[PDB]
Symmetry: C2
């Protein structure tokens, strides 16, 4: 069974609004078009979207919605799709996915801990074990003091249920795993060993950097399709194609999104030398630049350099 797993699109995002608005819509469409064109070529059987498809939790734009629906539609033409909305998907979208989910067997939204069964392109019977974002807000809501005895009982249920799979069991989560603190300088974090060990694949979303979290069960974050801000100069962007065969270990292959790069320039004083360096370093750079400096002054660089998006102290 062939799978396209992709995530964390953030449709409608514009970066650096406090300093120099760049609408990411063109770059983002470039990547999504590349991903979808790739999934058509490989003739995948199932498409897994693990959330944060939209960027605005409360006020998505019509353009953004139109886009998302366009893509959902192109994808459905190639294979059945399963969506696990995340923390930053507009609440209205969960309502629509709930409505469209009854109407079709070619798209299906999962918004609870309840497992659902689905058929893929070629009839493969797939069991979805979903784990939506553990929101601090819905732990205050539930008013159960220790939230963890509860998440743990859910991860147990999904394990008991994965054991009854017919063809494949696939876990879908939207959260952060016990990654890496302390980056300088809060979430309900889930330990990766807690993801049920018996599923054939564990598709994650929420993290923007592609990472192969563990091998048994195969657990991946595909990452964003673009670099959203400057904490993402060094990671990898794209989606992931996964193959599952009953007798065998899972195999996978990245589709790199080929995102525009980001770069930071560091200076003590903005000298005449610095000005030259900044001008020279931005001139032929195909992406976006931030400069940070230590000692004060300062000319209008952003009026002169189209790709200089941030200047700090």
């Amino acid at each position: 069974m062939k799978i396209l797993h992709t995530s964390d699109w953030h449709l409608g995002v514009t970066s650096w609004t406090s300093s120099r608005p760049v609408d990411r819509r063109e770059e983002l469409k470039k990547a999504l078009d590349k991903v979808v064109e790739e999934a058509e070529k490989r003739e995948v059987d199932l498409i897994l979207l693990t959330g944060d498809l939209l960027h605005s939790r409360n006020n998505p734009s019509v353009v953004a919605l139109h886009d998302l629906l366009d893509y959902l539609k192109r994808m459905m033409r190639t294979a059945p799709v399963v969506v696990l909305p995340g923390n930053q998907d507009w609440k209205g979208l969960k309502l629509f996915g709930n409505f469209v989910t009854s109407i079709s067997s070619d798209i299906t939204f999962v918004m609870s801990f309840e497992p659902v069964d689905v058929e893929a392109k070629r009839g493969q019977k797939v069991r979805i074990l979903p784990f939506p974002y553990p929101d601090e807000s819905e732990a205050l809501r539930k008013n159960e003091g220790d939230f963890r005895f509860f998440l743990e009982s859910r991860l147990n249920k999904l394990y008991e249920e994965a054991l009854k799979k017919e063809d494949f069991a696939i876990f879908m989560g939207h959260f952060t795993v016990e990654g890496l603190a302390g980056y300088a300088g809060r979430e309900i974090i889930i330990n990766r060993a807690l993801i049920p060990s018996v599923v054939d694949y564990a598709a994650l979303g929420h993290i923007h950097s592609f990472r192969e979290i563990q091998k048994q069960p195969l657990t991946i974050y595909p990452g964003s399709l673009i670099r959203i801000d400057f904490g993402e100069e060094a990671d990898e962007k794209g989606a992931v194609f996964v193959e599952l065969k009953r007798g065998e270990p899972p195999r996978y292959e990245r589709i790199d999104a080929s995102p525009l790069p980001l770069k930071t320039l560091y200076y003590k004083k903005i000298d005449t030398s610095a000005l030259k360096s900044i001008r020279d370093s931005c001139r032929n750079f195909p992406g976006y630049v931030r400069v940070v400096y230590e000692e004060d002054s300062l000319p209008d660089l952003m009026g002169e350099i189209d790709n200089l998006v941030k200047i700090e102290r």
Copy 2:
């Protein structure tokens, strides 16, 4: 060759000072004593400390220094030690390590990109390829606009130098790798593929969660020995014992620090029910508790519950 790799001790830390000071010194000594006692038992050949041994960058306490020196001394009695101070080690410590480094062949500090050679307990000839923290401050200092063409030239040098090893080449770094953003809601991050592939082991520090970053070359963060604040409820603490043999793939084994646990309780309103839940949930818990709630009021819980260290909204 047998190695003890341990890191990120944070000697002298007291947690939750803004809300309920807990001096971590006792718990921390418990762990360090366990680690060192373990390294004596296994009779390791080399000890690698990858930085952030002290907690205070500018104002470490005498007690903290006394402690650090005690441990450095016990360790030297069992095997030669190599230290890569990190971002949060007091500047005075770098001065001392620089001074003590000439005087002895049983301890050696590495504070630049310059490789140094060392002998282990039993004569094994080891090549250290160090990579100290890429501080934003020392990139403003250097005043070289694009810092990355520079770090890259250094990682190249260390690779060219690892190829001339006699017995073992070992990389020591103090930084964050392209981990996982966006955790809700800056550093010079280094991509793990950039760590020279030819070294036999790559010892990292700065990250508090034990993680096996990659297998070839074997790259580990051992993690803290304690859980510093509440962003570390789910990760693992301890040190790492590593074995390297010329013909063979590297092998390793964690020493769990057995740290005191942390826990968050979530409530809508602090009711009479909540009060009961909080009281019941803290009563027999061997670690530290934080409660967060949504709607306002509120009694003196911290006067009544010794292990309740934080209350938010």
